[PDB]
Amino acid sequence: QVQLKQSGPGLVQPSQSLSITCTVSGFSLTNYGVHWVRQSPGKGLEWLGVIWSGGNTDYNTPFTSRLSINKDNSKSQVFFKMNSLQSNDTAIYYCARALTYYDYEFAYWGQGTLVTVSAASTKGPSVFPLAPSSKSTSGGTAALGCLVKDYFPEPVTVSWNSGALTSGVHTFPAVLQSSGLYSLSSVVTVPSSSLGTQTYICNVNHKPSNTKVDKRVEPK
Amino acid sequence: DILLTQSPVILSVSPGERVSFSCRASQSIGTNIHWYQQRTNGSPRLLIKYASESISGIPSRFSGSGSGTDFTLSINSVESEDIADYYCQQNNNWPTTFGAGTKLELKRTVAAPSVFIFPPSDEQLKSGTASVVCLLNNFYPREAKVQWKVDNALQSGNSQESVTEQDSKDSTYSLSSTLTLSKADYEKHKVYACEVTHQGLSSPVTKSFNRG
Amino acid sequence: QFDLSTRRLK
C-alpha cells in the first residue's frame, strides 16, 4: 500500500534549523511529487512546498529563502529542511502525495511531525500509576490509569498492553504546568473481576527524550 | 492568495440528521476545490475532489456541490464517527490554500458522569510532590464543575483540567481534574474530596478518601 | 483555533 512515514517529533532551538525525513513506500519518487504541508495554531493548514519527480522544487512565497527540499530516489526518502525558526513556526509538519503526479489533491499523508520551537531543554516524563480501588469501582467496572508527569516537549504516546487493550481507553490532552513542563493522564475502564487475573500495563513513549517506560498498574 | 472562508466554525447536530458545510472563496475558482476530514490526533483525510467527484473508500453519505465562489460539503445522515474538523482547499490559483475549518459536534441524550478518585502513588510521594486525580467518565454535555476540598478547605488555583475530544463511538466526553500538592502539605491533612456537578445529576457527587 | 495537542479546532 501507499505509505508516508516521517521521522520522530523533536525540539528545535530558536534561530536553529529544522530537519525531517519522509520515507515512502508503495510508489516510486521517480513517478510522484512529494508535497509538504504544516498546521499551526496561527495559520491552520498551509502549503509549504513540493519536490517533483524530476527533482524540481517549488517553495511557497514566504519560504523561498529558508526552505530546502531534497530527496534520494533509491532510498525512497525525501528530506525537508527549514532555516531560522521562530516560536510561531511551532506546528505539525506533514509530507503528502497527490492522486496524480501533477496534481494537488492530497490523498496520502505522512503521520506528521510535531515540531516545538523553544530554547528549553528536553525532559523525559515520570510515570505513576493511577491504582484501581473501591473508589474507582462502579457496578463491576473499575477505572485505572497512568499519570505521565513533567515532560517536554510534546508529544508522548500512550498505549495499553502493547495495543491489545483499546476499549474504554481515554488519553487526555496534555496541559502545560507553571514549571513549563507538560503533564497528562491516561485511563481505562475494565471489569473489576479481571484485576486478579489480567495484567495492565501502560506503554509510555516520549520520543524526544528517548524515554520508554512500561508501567504496570495494580490495586494497592 | 485566494482567501477561503468556512462558515460557521462550529456545527452541532443530532445523529441521522443531514448537515452542510460551507466554503466561500474570495474570488471565482470554478470547481477547483477539495474537502478534508481531520479526526482527533489524525492527519487530513481526502473526502471530495473537484467540488463533487467522489473518493475511493469514502462513504456515499459524503457529497459536495457548488461552483464559482460558493461551495457546500454535505452529509445526508450524520453518524457518531463523523465527529471531526472539515477543511476546504482551493487550487485554481497558486499557491493552493486551505480554509480555517469547521468543527462538527454531535448532540445526544444527557448522560451523568461516573466519578472516580485516585490518591497519589507512594512512588510520586518520594519525589516530594502529590498529585490527586479526579476522573469524570463518559458524560454529556461537556459542561461540568469540579471542586476540590482538603479537610473541608476549598482548594483554588492548584488544580488543572483536561477534557477529551468528543468520543466518536458514543458521543460523550471525559474530564480529568488533577490537584497538585507538595508532599508536606499532603501529609498534613486527611480527607480529600472532589465534588462534581453536572446536568445529569440530581445532586452533586462527592468521591473522597482518607490518607491512610 | 487549531490545537497541536489533539489536532482539533478549539
Author numbering:
A (entry chain B): 1 to 220
B (entry chain A): 1 to 212
C (entry chain E): 2 to 11
From the paper:
Our recent discovery of meditope, a cyclic peptide that binds to a Fab cavity of cetuximab, can serve as an alternative, noncovalent method to modify antibodies, with a precise ratio of two meditopes to one IgG. We have also determined important residues emanating from the Fab through systematically grafting the binding site onto M5A, an anti-CEA mAb. In this report, we investigate the possibility of increasing the affinity of this interaction by reaching through to the other side of the Fab hole. In these structural analyses, we observed that the guanidinium nitrogen (NH2) of arginine in position 8, located in the ‘back’ of the meditope-binding pocket, is partially exposed to the other side of the Fab. We wondered whether it was possible to reach through the other side of the Fab hole by extending the side chain of Arg8, increasing the surface area to improve the affinity of the meditope–Fab interaction.
To test this, we synthesized a series of extensions of Arg8 starting with the addition of aliphatic carbon chains. The methyl group extended towards a hydrophobic pocked lined with Pro9, Leu114 and Pro155 HC. In summary, increasing the surface area and adding groups that are capable of forming electrostatic interactions between the meditope and the meditope-enabled mAb improved the half-life of the interaction. The simple extension of the Arg8 with an n-butyl group indicated that it is possible to thread the Fab ‘hole’.
